[PDB]
Design a binder for these strands. Structure first.
Lengths: 263, 255, 263, 258
DNA sequence: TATATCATCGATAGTGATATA
DNA sequence: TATATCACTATCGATGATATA
């Protein structure tokens, strides 16, 4: 049926329902006026004028501009192919746009695209208070270290982490431990000194220092001194991830590293 | 990224506004949570979820192993090209569909198919009528092409000449390179078709043989591809244009 | 009331309802957590987390990144103006963008804009049949002539237009009339020759010619010879508006003009 | 480039898709009938009518005197300028509305403000740095150390000078690219007067603001700065501040006097 | 009967409420 | 209590139907 003809035009030749029905009628009857198209098709009378005129622009029909516009269809063997030929031409240029767009994006993204692979955030600053939260974040730093692990503990750490440290040390992580001499007695049964005496890590001690810290690679962990709170194990501690800041702390640690007696 | 990266993705990669932003965010940080997204981007929190699964269903993001739940970006160099390929192939699938749809129509309209002036809109449709004039030619063919009137109809011209039709061809010098591999020149130097060329002429036309075809000139119309072209079937009119053709003909090189 | 404060923020500071209520709550209580904000405001519990984060980015609140995010408002005397200062920077560039866009449009549109203002549509081609339609279009040409009017009539014109011609001639339009001498007898008593004899226009005559035409400026009007139709006055005539085409017709008329007797 | 023109009209002139196309068509031919438009343009016939009166209601087109239902275009050089001006005036009309709304809020929030404990806060965006650095300058009493990159303490010269007048020792270190900004600035008047040391250096890794045991610094992540989400930290701690102060004093000795 | 307008659908994009553990 | 999704609105653009002299 003609339904098939109409259906084919809409899908592959960019003609709408009315425009489709129109062209089919044109080929069928040869020459038609807007008024005639309404009687020999299903196209609404009021639309027959802009529909045929629309076809006039797309190149499907020819016209006689007058009081009574006459329209005749172009040979379907002609229009149907030029459409494809043009359609192939429009797709080619549309392709060119996609490639140039790709190159630009790959150019703009080059500086932005980085091997950053979190490790959740995105967050370079974290506030920890609880004893539970203090330990969990402490383990993450050690169990994720890759280059160096620097520790300056004066008893602000809630729990001993010998195993968490050794777990990293055995992973090929260079480690430096600095402790207050009022902590050494607590390390007699702990077998970290073994790694120290065996030279698997460096362990020194100092009488006192007012800037405890835990440096793990680009991350650093310290507390906002409030001795009243530390006793209640609710002291506020801050985690910061930045090479500029850590680079600064590393200098202080090196400062503390000296003047320290080897255990 | 700014407007530009989000812009290109929307315009040339079928991504909506939110999706365009989200993808950018992923590329920047590598891994993002729906909440982390709303915070870092101008994508509403309530939309961050649906938008993210829309980015994986489109192939820009993929859920990282281990929920719940983080998303990673598909590296641009990969996802961008795969979109092009999958696009070209959908195009190739269409062009063939068109070529197949064309034949089905032509076979359906066969039964249906079986004066004195007609108008054609657009210089890109000129050949839709000039061809019928070349197939109906019997005695004489005079052509002064500007580059649009009879493009890619070289076969119908030679085909007409073989039918013993007197053929005179006048061209602009800028069209010479196009005829290099053309069989037309082979018919010109063989002396079965006259072919002269000149620099510029005001009125391009095609007369074959008692019919005339010419295009009007209105710069405003040419922007919209709505230039007016006229087909007139009249010996008195055609005779007039022929005087003009013979006029242009007098100042040309054999070439 | 708080309504006013909220109402004012939404309208002039680009904050939505929830974000507004949030900031108001922040200033009221000083420091709040997402959960707390739900109890002292109208912000939905589930939204309080992304809302505070939203204020955090716009610069309305400060935060303590942790398991329990603490948020504090920035002094409204600060943010409210800093917003304006930024708002003016964004409006300024948007202005420059609109202006830079303006110059570009005026360059691209310069060649397209022309003082051409047609009387009856942007149609340069008309097909006319019948005496009524033939005459109306003929008068339009005369009532629109400005430079020159060239006429070669052999009776294909449906009606005498002496007055329509004179109306134009008196308007300062140079006119040339060419007729078949088998029409002159139809001009006895006619007061057109007066303008001819008085030299207000040029009037000549010729034995015969097979290309009648009516040239009015850039327009030309002729018929596709069908003597059978001309008798029934239904011959098909064409109106064309183009200087290139008319320039050709003007030459043909000039050809007949010389070989024509001035009588 | 018709595509370009329609693009620009839509982007910078609040014109709809059809309206942008319609106007262009008008400019090309000068006068168009709704039917004549649909034929020559990509505007649907059923829309050409409403669209045209929408172009006049925006001031791009006007009904011909005929009228004969014909529309002519308002010359771009005119209609374009009229849009900007009427926009600027609508903008200036808004700026005052904002400035007026601002004061009304401050008087409404006056009763609320009675709170301005915690010693650490985070601020998102280098463009929001001053929202906190200001409070640090108002609370200054003894010492102020500033290493500005051009964002840490921008437009706070008034709050800075006010602090200096309160007898606070002030050292300001800047990048050479910031020197031109201080031209005719009263800072120099306080510099040449010798009540505040002002040195300059080429480049330093860690910009900061130290004022009375408080420190303000911004972290560095290029990805975040694109989104204006750079993380900035405020820390109130003598041990920490003392650390930053050591770094500042380091930069200070290598800086140029200016 | 030609000149004039409407109604439908799906896609966005903004913004204010609700749902599963 | 924190994660999770939804929902109502307007504007837009393409498409199929009516309206008024």
């Amino acid at each position: 049926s003609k339904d098939r003809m109409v259906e084919l035009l809409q899908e592959h030749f960019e003609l709408n329902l009315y425009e489709a029905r129109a062209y089919v009628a044109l080929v069928a009857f040869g020459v038609l006026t807007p008024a005639e198209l309404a009687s020999v098709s299903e196209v609404p009378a009021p639309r027959t004028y802009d529909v045929l005129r629309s076809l006039e622009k797309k190149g499907f029909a020819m016209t006689q501009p007058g009081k009574t516009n006459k329209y005749r269809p172009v040979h379907p063997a002609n229009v149907l192919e030029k459409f494809i030929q043009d359609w192939q031409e429009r797709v080619k240029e549309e392709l060119e746009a996609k490639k140039k767009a790709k190159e630009e994006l790959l150019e703009l993204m080059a500086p932005l695209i980085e091997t950053e692979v979190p490790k959740y955030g995105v967050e370079r600053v974290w506030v920890v208070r609880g004893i539970k939260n203090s330990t969990l974040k402490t383990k993450e730093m050690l169990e994720e270290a890759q280059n160096e692990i620097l520790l300056a503990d004066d008893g602000f750490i809630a729990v001993n982490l010998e195993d968490d440290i050794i777990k990293a040390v055995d992973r090929g992580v260079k480690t430096k431990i600095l402790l207050t001499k009022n902590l050494l007695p607590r390390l007699k049964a702990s077998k970290i000194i073994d790694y120290a005496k065996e030279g698997k890590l460096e362990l020194r001690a100092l009488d006192k220092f007012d800037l405890p810290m835990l440096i793990c690679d680009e991350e650093v962990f310290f507390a906002l001194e409030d001795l009243a709170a530390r006793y209640f194990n609710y002291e506020t501690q801050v985690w910061i991830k930045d090479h500029r800041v850590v680079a600064l702390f590393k200098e202080k640690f090196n400062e503390y590293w000296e003047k320290a007696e080897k255990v």
